[PDB]
């Protein structure tokens, strides 16, 4: 509910649309740089730290037992509190390939305000999903047992339906959800009759029994489906039970960002509603035991610099603070081509 302009460090070019903001004990790290790693930073992850609305991207190193990984430009990620760590999988390479490997970022050590990481990857057996981007991953619990729930984004054509002149064209994947054990790597696709087509850059909320979907864009008819989804999960002793229901009240949005403000209390910043007009108004949500209800805020004021532009992007830093950017105006021809704002929600 408060716009703040940020000044910038020297290395602007490592930022790019489609980044990753990770958080550990309030300390926030940048992932997903532009280009490839350099002699300055061998990894690509940085201490994203801001004082007096001034950012500095200063490097962060790995452990010995860590695994190295390229920057991924549109992955999916989720929190794993079971210690605490992040689960990241999917994404797009700097050379525009699509991997399907599941990397685990764990904090190795932190000493004298210098922290290191313990990156490991994990593969899967059985019904593997095809590599994609714009998809969504969430962790959910039941009976004390944890399980990762996935929902697809979009991908290329398969190897038979791919030619030269259409080598880069994309299509929505098949509407299936995958159940991913992290103790062994068990993966199982599931076919759901209420679900119809693919979906990309949809917003994903999960609270301990049932994962909520919202918004996103469907490539199949070039619309934004204005219907939310409520996806009930049960994991008994036997085979796990997946359930889905359709509820009214969905808002037609794509490429927004979620943020926890208070306990069981989340908020939504504006993304896109049509591909000709930016979506300006932003929304809230509130969860109970099983209820779900949207809400709208008091339309927090932007600069006109936003209101005259065309696009944006962004993510969240975790602690009720939305960090986002905007391409500059090349008409004035004295721009650094990118400005940035931080939106404290509190």
């Amino acid at each position: 509910m408060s716009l703040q302009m940020v000044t910038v460090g020297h290395n602007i070019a490592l930022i790019q649309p489609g980044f990753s903001l990770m958080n550990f004990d309030g300390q926030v790290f940048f992932f997903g740089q532009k280009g490839w790693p350099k002699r300055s930073c061998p990894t690509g992850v940085f201490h994203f730290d801001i004082k007096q609305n001034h950012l500095k991207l200063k490097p962060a190193i790995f452990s010995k037992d860590s695994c190295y990984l390229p920057p991924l430009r549109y992955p999916a990620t989720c929190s794993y509190k079971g210690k605490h760590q992040y689960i990241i999988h999917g994404g797009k390479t700097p050379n525009n390939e699509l991997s399907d490997k599941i990397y685990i970022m764990s904090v190795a050590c932190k000493n004298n305000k210098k922290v290191t990481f313990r990156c490991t990857e994990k593969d899967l057996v059985g019904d593997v999903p095809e590599p994609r981007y714009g998809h969504s991953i969430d962790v959910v619990y039941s009976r004390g047992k944890s399980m990762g729930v996935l929902f697809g984004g979009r991908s290329y054509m398969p190897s038979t339906q791919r030619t030269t002149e259409k080598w880069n064209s994309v299509a929505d994947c098949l509407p299936h959800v995958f159940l991913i054990d992290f103790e062994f790597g068990c993966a199982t696709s599931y076919i759901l009759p209420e679900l119809q087509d693919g979906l990309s850059f949809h917003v994903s909320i999960a609270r301990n029994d049932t994962v909520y979907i919202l918004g996103g864009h469907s490539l199949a008819s070039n619309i934004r489906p204005a219907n939310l989804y409520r996806i009930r999960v049960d994991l008994p002793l036997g085979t796990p039970a997946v359930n889905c229901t359709v509820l009214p009240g969905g808002i037609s949005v794509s490429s927004a960002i979620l943020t926890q403000t208070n306990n069981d209390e989340f908020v939504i910043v504006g993304g896109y509603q049509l591909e000709n007009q930016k979506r300006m108004v932003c929304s809230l949500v509130s969860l109970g035991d099983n209820t779900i209800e949207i809400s709208e805020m008091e339309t927090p004021d932007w600069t006109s610099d936003i209101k005259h532009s065309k696009i944006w992007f962004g993510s969240n830093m975790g602690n009720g603070t939305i960090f986002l950017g905007i391409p500059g105006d090349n008409k004035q021809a004295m721009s650094e081509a990118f400005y940035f704002y931080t939106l404290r929600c509190s």
Binding site: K34, W36, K38, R39, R73, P94, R162, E165, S169
Partner: protein, 320 residues
Amino acid sequence: YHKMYRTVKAITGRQIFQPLHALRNAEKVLLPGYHPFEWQPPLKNVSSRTDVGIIDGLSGLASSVDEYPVDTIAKRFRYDSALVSALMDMEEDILEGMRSQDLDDYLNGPFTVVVKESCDGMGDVSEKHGSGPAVPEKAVRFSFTVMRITIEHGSQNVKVFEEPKPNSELCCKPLCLMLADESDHETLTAILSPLIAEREAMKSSELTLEMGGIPRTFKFIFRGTGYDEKLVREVEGLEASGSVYICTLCDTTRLEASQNLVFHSITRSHAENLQRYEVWRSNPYHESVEELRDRVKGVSAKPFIETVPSIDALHCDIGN
């Protein structure tokens, strides 16, 4: 040209030049995508439609708002059709070459064609007389050149055609043009990757053509030598310039290069570079950062373009 044509046609009475539609037909006979041909392997992931010309360079990208933004403009040819049109252009020369080398005008293949491969950016192309500085506007081409053509008879091979001026401006046929920065990595590889796919599909194929009234067959061999230094260090996956690793053939450090002067060899290849990058990803021995840095010899990025590097004499004597 229309003015010149109509004025000389009026003043002489005879029509010494040609009008414009005949000029359009004479240029449509020389573009890519006119003559028919086929391939003895059916060329997987290639559309076998045989009348395509200038196609969009983005190969159907994803220019919507909700995607990663890219505002570049790229126009390209399909690779096989441009190769076909280049061969049909040099048809009369290859006819008279094989006549001059004491052979028959009737001869089936296979003609083996060795092709130079190159790429370069041309810096700024903007023209603003005022309005302050307008736009830097960097752009880059991607081109090729037929270097030599050869043919055997039984077991004895003969160079049937050699080119006199390799690096000249009149023999660099362009595949694709894009208005983009040379170092803007992801856009560059995203446009150039389908032509790489077409090249690797074409590497193990057989062309069949109908030039001299009789069919001929063709194989191909590609040498990626026409790159410059900053680009070959960028698109193969090496460090830019500030490493200890300076040799693009031998893994000699800057320390050993001052120490050992000549006693090295050539030890860099494409598949081993892929393997080294996979070692950099996997990190199988859980070592530290610097020992990985010296174990892989500067390998940092995924290699994606095969390239056989070389030099030129200006850099040699200027370093001397």
